[PDB]
């Protein structure tokens, strides 16, 4: 019970409820994985993943005899990158756990859900903005983001023409795949006044999404694809037990993700 250090203070049903809660909270909170293709899970053992920097256009050639070189040569200094850990800590009272054990009180995981939401927000912020201290890159922090002016959002057609200009830049840089747009809440709202949301959704063909991690007036359009961007995962959202600080039982929502922008020309920062 509470009189000794616990191997696990929660039973299997409580563990299952905790896992479902954190999974659903994460699912409702991340806008990233909806545009980023997810690489295969690797387990907690893997700590580093290869990082590609394929800068340079090269389209498969057309010929009767395949005697023309069209290959992506490996860049010097492959520059492997380590996978960070995204986590958030929450607490469960020992008195609450014992009131669940005896008297059959239903255990409350609201703190766990809040921790999962904060963890998802943090990893989305990491995806959209690199860590200066960790030396990482994001969609809005990369080099070669093809910045384009974004003025005249107030007019109904300003957002449409800005996104069209961004798509034109992407086409000129050699990317013609599916497109996805992620906008700040302010930009998303003004594009709902005018019904233009539908036109953009059709222009994108992948999705127009809204994220709070963006600045006051900012937005991004990305040519979605595995070669263009990737999200390597070592482990997904899971709850781990952090011993017994004082007597209250600490748990931590844990995951391991890494953004790999292999083609920096696939991103156009509307700002």
């Amino acid at each position: 019970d509470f009189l000794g250090h616990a191997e696990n203070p929660l039973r299997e049903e409580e563990w299952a409820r905790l896992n479902e809660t954190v999974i659903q909270v994460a699912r409702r909170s991340l806008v990233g994985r909806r545009i980023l293709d997810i690489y295969g899970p690797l387990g907690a053992g893997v700590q580093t993943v290869p990082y590609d920097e394929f800068q340079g256009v090269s389209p498969g050639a057309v010929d009767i005899v395949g005697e023309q070189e069209t290959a992506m040569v490996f860049t010097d200094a492959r520059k492997f990158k380590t996978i960070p850990i995204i986590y958030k800590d929450f607490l469960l009272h020992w008195r609450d756990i014992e009131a669940a054990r005896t008297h059959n009180m239903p255990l409350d995981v609201s703190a766990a859900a809040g921790a999962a939401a904060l963890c998802a927000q943090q990893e989305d912020e990491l995806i959209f903005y690199g860590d200066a201290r960790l030396g990482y890159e994001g969609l809005m922090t990369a080099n070669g983001r093809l910045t384009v002016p974004l003025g005249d959002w107030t007019s109904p057609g300003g957002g449409f023409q800005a996104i069209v200009e961004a798509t034109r830049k992407l086409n000129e840089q050699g990317h013609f795949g599916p497109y996805a747009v992620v906008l700040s809440p302010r930009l998303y709202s003004q594009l709902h006044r005018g019904g233009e949301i539908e036109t953009i959704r059709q222009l994108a063909s992948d999705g127009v999404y809204q994220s709070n991690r963006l600045r006051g007036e900012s937005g991004v359009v990305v040519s979605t694809g595995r070669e263009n961007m990737d999200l390597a995962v070592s482990m997904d959202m899971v709850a781990a037990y952090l011993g017994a600080s004082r007597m209250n039982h600490p748990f931590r929502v844990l995951e391991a993700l890494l953004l790999r922008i292999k083609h920096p020309d696939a991103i156009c920062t509307l700002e």
């Binding site: 994460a26 994985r33 997810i38």
Partner: peptide, 11 residues
């Protein structure tokens, strides 16, 4: 010994 991806594959 299964990875058992849980939250991903939202797309």
């Amino acid at each position: 010994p299964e990875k058992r991806l849980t939250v991903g594959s939202l797309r």
